[PDB]
């Protein structure tokens, strides 16, 4: 397994509708937990197990930091657009976080992006920033001029970040470690025949579907649709195998220890 905690930040130079000037959303195992934007100017929980375990003090201090960080982040976009002599709409993005893998080996990442492309990347082992263009090099030498910060980065990315994540995973362990089994059915879409094996409504987004020919032969001429989200917190997937009027296909589905074999007409 693996668990991760990520905090993104976005800055646009045109606060249009449905896109604020500054956005910052935290994620745990690709699940929204926190949210902030210049329209609300308040940090809010994106999950119910976040609002019940985090005291109202945690939603009052980090707002102030985010309010300050909003001014800094929007300022950095202005400073970059000067170096590039850019005007109009441009995006400045940030990713920071850690992930706690199985076998204990933790990692730490922190990187920026300008207009979708990577701008500068931090190395917590070398205590240095990696530049992609000359403008990012001027940023590197300025950021690498305050050793108090680079050493602060390594501590958070390695020690502080994990402590939040382990604290966060214990919160909402009932939701983050839930188990809901799929509704698996098989259909028939004939040629202008293709059989479909679809599952619906499983929370743990790891499900295996293998379509078996005769009694024992894995059909290799198959198509796969990814685990799409549904909206209710569950996912869904499908797999197709173009058949032929042969004188026996079976779909094998396993999800969280519930193995199920289905016919195929």
């Amino acid at each position, epitope marked *: 397994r693996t668990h991760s905690l990520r905090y993104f930040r976005l800055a646009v130079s045109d606060p249009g509708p449905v896109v604020p000037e500054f956005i910052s959303v935290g994620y745990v195992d690709s699940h929204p937990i926190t949210t902030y934007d210049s329209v609300t100017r308040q940090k809010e929980p994106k999950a119910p197990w976040m609002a019940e375990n985090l005291a109202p*003090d*945690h939603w009052e*201090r*980090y707002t*102030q*930091l985010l*309010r*300050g*960080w909003q*001014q*800094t982040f929007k*300022a950095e976009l202005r400073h970059l657009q000067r170096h590039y002599n850019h005007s109009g709409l441009h995006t400045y993005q940030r990713m920071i976080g850690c992930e706690l893998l199985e076998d204990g080996s933790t990692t730490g990442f922190l990187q920026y992006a300008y207009d979708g492309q990577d701008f500068i990347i931090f190395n917590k082992d070398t205590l240095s920033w990696l530049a992609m263009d000359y403008v990012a090099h001027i940023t590197k030498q300025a950021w690498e001029a*305050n050793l*108090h*910060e680079l*050493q*602060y*980065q*390594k*501590n*958070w990315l390695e*020690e*502080e970040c994990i*402590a939040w994540l382990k604290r966060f995973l214990e919160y909402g362990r009932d939701t983050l470690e839930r188990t809901e089994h799929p509704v698996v059915r098989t259909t028939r879409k004939e040629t202008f025949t293709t059989f479909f094996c679809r599952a619906h409504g499983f929370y743990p987004p790891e499900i295996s579907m293998t379509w078996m020919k005769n009694g024992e032969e894995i059909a290799q001429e198959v198509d796969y649709g990814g685990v799409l989200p549904s909206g209710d917190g569950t996912y869904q997937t499908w797999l197709s195998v173009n058949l032929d009027p042969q004188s026996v296909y079976s779909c094998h589905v396993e999800h969280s220890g519930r193995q199920m074999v289905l016919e195929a007409p």
Partner: antibody
Framework: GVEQPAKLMSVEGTFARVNCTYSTSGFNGLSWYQQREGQAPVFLSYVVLDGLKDSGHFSTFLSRSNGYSYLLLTELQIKDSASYLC??????????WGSGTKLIIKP | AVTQSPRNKVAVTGGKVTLSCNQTNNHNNMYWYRQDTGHGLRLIHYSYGAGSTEKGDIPDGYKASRPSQENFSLILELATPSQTSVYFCASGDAKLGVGAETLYFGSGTRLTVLE
């Protein structure tokens, strides 16, 4: 949250290590400040990783697991007799200020 | 760099005392502490930018306002003897993250509230 001694004596021309022991929730840094009588605090050194920071006329050590740091002041003179403050940063970024150690130097 | 006015003040119990601070360092963060004998430096109010004003550890009886970037005044609407202390104004660059901040203190302000 942060505990600190209140007095220290050492001969002129010798050294003096001033201790600091924090019990904060998280830890984002440890900063030393020098406040001398009527004057205002002056930043001395910031330390967040384990090790010794050989700044020259002083040094700073930090032990994260023990939750302990000391400031090693060397080549002391009379002007260095002051009070030394250590402030630690919370897991929510709050400076927890200690009570300060009054270092007095013997002439 | 960082200065404070008035440098000294002798107020009466139930008076209007406004301790203002001015900075030349282009810093977005300014603070207000008070140094008492038993306790360490204790925050009263701070600000992360012009207009924003938040509370600290001891906002009891204290008000603060940041009219401009360079000024962050501590307003004492009703003065009381328990507010007699030496107050210190600080500054910090918000670009150095929130952890590596080096507070630049201004000089003291000896306030005394008498009956």
């Amino acid at each position: 949250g942060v505990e600190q001694p209140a007095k220290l004596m050492s001969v002129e021309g010798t050294f003096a290590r001033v201790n600091c022991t924090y019990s904060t929730s998280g830890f984002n840094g440890l900063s030393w400040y020098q406040q001398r009588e009527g004057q205002a605090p002056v930043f001395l050194s910031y330390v967040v990783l384990d090790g010794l920071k050989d700044s020259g006329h002083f040094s700073t050590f930090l032990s994260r697991s023990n939750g302990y740091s000391y400031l090693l002041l060397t080549e002391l003179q009379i002007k260095d007799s002051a009070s030394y403050l250590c402030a630690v940063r919370d897991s929510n970024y709050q400076l927890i200020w200690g009570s300060g150690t009054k270092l007095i130097i013997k002439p | 760099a960082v200065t404070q006015s008035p440098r000294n003040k002798v107020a009466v119990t139930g008076g209007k005392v406004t301790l203002s601070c001015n900075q030349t360092n282009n810093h977005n963060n300014m603070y207000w502490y008070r140094q008492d004998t038993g306790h360490g430096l204790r925050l009263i109010h701070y600000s992360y930018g012009a207009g924003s004003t938040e509370k600290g550890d001891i906002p009891d009886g204290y008000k603060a306002s940041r009219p401009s970037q360079e000024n962050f005044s501590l307003i004492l609407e009703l003065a009381t003897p328990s507010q007699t202390s030496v107050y210190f104004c600080a500054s910090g660059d918000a670009k150095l993250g929130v952890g590596a901040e080096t507070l630049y203190f201004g000089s003291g302000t000896r306030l005394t509230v008498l009956e």
